[PDB]
């Protein structure tokens, strides 16, 4: 089973430097020709760097846009690759994932989140919904950088749940959740917000009380 | 090189073939022989998927429902008996020059048409205890995807500090949701009573209104 | 200035389908009306579809006679639409013009040709006309479908031009140019018919010889 | 709802005035006061071109000349001081309800008469070196625009086989233009060889002849 983990990003300063990480398992990773791909709402999908085969002496390439100020590295006894950002740009903000395999970008994980700011992180506050067959909302508010995680009762009610996008405005991000239950089934079985933001280490549970 | 994917959006009904283009400013055909095409599929809140390389090959797991074909500068993704599953964004990329990635198609499920379910919600004890004050409205499971709404405050209308966002499209039902978070100062919002949330949809000449009033 | 650039028409089969844009700049696209309209030697002018203002909800409306085959659709933030359609009839057959505008059809494209055909494309035949002041001409024949372009040396002649409309004739087309230069001009100075066939991707050179 | 155009066509003097009438078969009153109709010009070889909307306003760009006016069921597009550039075909338009279009009316200028210049071609020799064989005439710059063309071969009139194509009026010096090509066998053509292209024209008394002879 072929698995490919990205980590190590998140909020940094114009000019800053940052390194990201791939962790993979499941194929001969030295066999694999690696990339590094992003992705942003402006500009979409970019290819970022790769670093080839043992066979081809791990050979690298950069975009032209990010040459000279990232390097790119792997270990494959660790089955490991590397991303290493200096002086990074508001424009360098995005989602960057891990990709590779004997077939070029036949696997991808599920990426990481790099964001270059100024802006400084927040942590949300965390309000419960309680109505005016039921629905149920939690909003999630004044936060950054993304990402937070929301569930409802630790994941255990998926359905009939909408979680909405963090939007940003002001330096500031939102976010909020509904779900939809029967009558029958709140307030007479609680049904609880669980809100987590990495960034700020906060980790909240919000009770919806009539 | 350039790699322009066509269309923007596509809206295709269930079992319906749909078929998608991206061309390039360039050949992509290699001095080896090869042309380096793939095709991938991007579900909501996941990563791209690998479908196709090399113009036509299916990755391993993927079905031959999908299909790529063309040469040159030319290529097609075509997709018959489109499932439920298979809504998302598509992308084409070529690696035969510097690795470039067109704009992507989004498919969408065509289905019949709802009108959306409306919930507003007060700002909540600990908000107000802060200093703050947010009203919240919920639209959800509507189609299709375009909808108005309008706060209106003791009657008239409110549209500074409102925050919206849209669900991607949910494929267990193939609507869509909506949030509007209107954000006020506390002592502004217990000057008013009236509360309204107003969403104008395609499915009913006219809005389906959401109220509280403070006392 | 106000563009409406119409791209993607050409030759379908009967029960084909096909996907035609409109590219739009120099106005707020996302405050615009839109309209597909389409034009033919039956039926004349006729709406197609219509799609409206984000404040209108972006709500689309389509004749009847296309009901449940074509799309309409559009993206504000590209200042693009489409028209996206099935099961194409012989009927369907016209010339496709983009209209739209803060007011209502207030700007047209130049449009697209859509032709749904099971005729097959053919290269024209291009042939040199010599005289029996002096008068030349260019006859392009047997082929399909529309458009081609005619043109004398590749456009420096253009005064004393006549082009002629193709007609139809057994599934296939044929077009002719003529131009009136003076005796001092020809055969003293080379002049030669340019002729593009896209659908069939050729570009022919004919040059005049007494 | 049908819009009627009338007149068909519209021969008019430059500096005169013109007027144009289109008829619909219901009410364009829409139920919130307005009128929604609309008038176009097609210049030839160009799209449609937006002159009035609302019945009376003149969008951005068109000349005062223009004027529109009428109520109910009954409008008139007027012209004054018609300038050459003028010509084209006028179209009015209603949306109050499901948009529809009048058949147009195609507007000429009228001009002091014109002899047409008149061209024979046999076939190249590029076509007869591939078994077909078109002899072409082009009859160009005339006015007015009636104008009738006749093949004879060997002093005998043939229909079968010709195509002919006429220019719209050309606002540059308002004449029009003809071709026409009899396409014949190999085999026919050289069969005979008197070719003969013959235009009866205002203009001339007497048939406009044009001949070659082969060998
Ligand atoms: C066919 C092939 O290997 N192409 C590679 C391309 O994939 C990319 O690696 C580039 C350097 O970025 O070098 C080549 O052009
Ligand atoms: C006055 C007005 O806007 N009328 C529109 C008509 O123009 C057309 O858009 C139709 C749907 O095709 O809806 C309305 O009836
Ligand atoms: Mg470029
Ligand atoms: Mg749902
Ligand atoms: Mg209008
Ligand atoms: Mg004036
Ligand atoms: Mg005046
Ligand atoms: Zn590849
Ligand atoms: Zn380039
Ligand atoms: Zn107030
Ligand atoms: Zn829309
Ligand atoms: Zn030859």
């Known amino acids: 089973q072929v698995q490919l983990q990205q980590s190590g990003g998140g909020l940094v300063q114009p000019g800053g430097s940052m390194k990201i990480f791939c962790?993979?398992?499941?194929?001969?990773?030295?066999?694999?020709?690696?990339?590094?791909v992003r992705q942003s709402p402006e500009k979409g999908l970019e290819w970022?760097?790769?670093?080839?085969?043992?066979?081809?002496?791990?050979?690298?390439?950069?975009?032209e846009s990010v040459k000279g100020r990232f390097t790119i590295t792997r270990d494959d006894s660790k089955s490991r690759m590397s991303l290493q950002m200096n002086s990074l740009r508001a424009e360098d903000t995005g989602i960057?994932?891990?990709?590779?395999?004997?077939?070029?970008?036949?696997?991808?994980?599920?990426g990481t989140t790099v964001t270059v700011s100024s802006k400084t992180t927040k942590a949300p506050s965390v309000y419960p919904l309680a109505p005016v067959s039921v629905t149920l909302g939690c909003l999630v508010k004044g936060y950054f950088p993304e990402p937070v995680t929301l569930t409802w009762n630790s994941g255990s009610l998926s359905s009939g749940v909408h979680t909405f996008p963090a939007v940003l405005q002001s330096d500031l991000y939102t976010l909020s959740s509904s779900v939809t239950v029967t009558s029958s089934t709140w307030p007479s079985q609680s049904i609880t917000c669980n809100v987590a933001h990495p960034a700020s280490s906060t980790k909240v549970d919000k009770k919806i009380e009539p | 090189i350039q790699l322009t994917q066509s269309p923007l959006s596509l809206p295709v009904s269930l079992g319906d073939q749909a078929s998608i283009s991206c061309?390039?400013?360039?050949?992509?055909?290699?001095?080896?022989?090869?042309?380096?095409?793939?095709?991938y599929l991007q579900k909501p809140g996941q990563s791209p998927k690998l479908?196709?390389?090399?113009?036509?090959?299916?990755?391993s797991g993927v079905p031959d429902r999908f299909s790529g074909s063309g040469s040159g500068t030319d290529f097609t993704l075509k997709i018959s008996s489109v499932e439920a599953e298979d809504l998302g964004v598509?992308?084409?990329?070529?690696?035969?020059?510097?690795?470039?990635?067109?704009?992507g198609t989004k498919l969408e499920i065509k289905r019949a048409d709802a009108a959306p379910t409306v919930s507003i919600f007060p700002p909540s004890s600990e908000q107000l205890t802060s200093g703050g004050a947010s009203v919240v409205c919920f639209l959800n499971n509507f189609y299709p995807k375009d909808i108005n709404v309008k706060w209106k405050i003791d009657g008239s209308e409110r549209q500074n500090g409102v925050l919206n966002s849209w669900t991607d499209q949910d494929s267990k039902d193939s609507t869509y949701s909506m949030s509007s978070t209107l954000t006020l100062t506390k002592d502004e919002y217990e000057r008013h009573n009236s509360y309204t949330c107003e969403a104008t949809h395609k499915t009913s000449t006219s809005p389906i209104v959401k109220s509280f009033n403070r006392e | 200035q106000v563009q409406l650039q119409q791209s993607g028409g050409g030759l379908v089969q009967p029960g084909g389908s096909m996907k035609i844009f409109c590219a739009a700049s120099?106005?707020?696209?996302?405050?615009?009306?839109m309209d597909w309209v389409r034009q033919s030697p039956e039926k004349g002018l006729e709406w197609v579809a219509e799609?409206?203002?984000?404040?209108?909800?972006?709500?689309?409306y389509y004749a009847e006679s296309v009901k449940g085959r074509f799309t309409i659709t559009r993206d504000d933030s590209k200042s693009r639409m489409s028209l996206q359609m099935n099961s194409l009839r012989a009927e369907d057959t016209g010339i496709y013009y983009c209209?739209?505008?803060?007011?209502?059809?207030?700007?047209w494209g130049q449009g697209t040709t859509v032709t749904v055909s099971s005729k097959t494309t053919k290269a024209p035949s291009v042939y040199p006309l010599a005289p029996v002041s002096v008068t030349l001409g260019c006859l392009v024949k047997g082929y399909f479908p529309e458009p081609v372009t005619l043109t004398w040396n590749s456009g420096s002649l253009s005064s004393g031009v006549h082009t002629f409309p193709a007609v139809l004739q057994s599934d296939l087309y044929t077009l002719s140019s003529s131009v009136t230069v003076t005796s001092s001009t020809w055969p003293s100075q080379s002049i030669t018919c340019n002729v593009a066939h896209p659908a069939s991707s050729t570009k022919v050179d004919k040059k005049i010889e007494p | 709802i049908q819009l009627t155009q009338s007149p068909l066509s519209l021969p008019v003097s430059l500096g005169d005035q013109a007027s144009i009438s289109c008829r619909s078969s219901?009410?364009?009153?829409?139920?919130?006061?307005?009128?929604?109709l609309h008038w176009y010009l097609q210049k030839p070889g160009q799209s449609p071109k937006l002159l009035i909307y609302?019945?009376?306003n003149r969008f951005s760009g068109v000349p005062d000349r223009f004027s529109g006016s009428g109520s109910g069921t009954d409008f008139t597009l007027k012209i004054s001081s018609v300038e050459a550039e003028d010509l084209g075909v006028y179209f009015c338009?209603?949306?109050?309800?499901?948009?529809?279009f009048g058949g147009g009316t195609k507007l000429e200028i009228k001009r002091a008469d014109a002899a047409p210049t008149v061209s024979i071609f046999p076939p190249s020799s590029e076509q007869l070196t591939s078994g077909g064989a078109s002899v072409v005439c082009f009859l160009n710059n005339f006015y007015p625009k009636d104008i009738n063309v006749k093949w004879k071969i060997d002093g005998s009139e043939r229909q079968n086989g010709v195509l002919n194509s006429w220019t719209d009026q050309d606002s540059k010096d308002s004449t029009y233009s003809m071709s026409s090509t009899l396409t014949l066998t190999k085999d026919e053509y050289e069969r005979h060889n008197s070719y003969t292209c013959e235009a009866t024209h205002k203009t001339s008394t007497s048939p406009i002849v044009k001949s070659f002879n082969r060998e």
């Open positions: 209209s739209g505008g803060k007011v209502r059809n207030a700007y």
């Open positions: 120099g106005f707020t696209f996302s405050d615009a009306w």
């Open positions: 799609i409206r203002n984000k404040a209108n909800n972006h709500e689309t």
């Open positions: 219901q009410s364009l009153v829409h139920s919130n006061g307005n009128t929604y």
């Open positions: 609302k019945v009376s």
């Open positions: 338009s209603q949306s109050t309800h499901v948009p529809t």
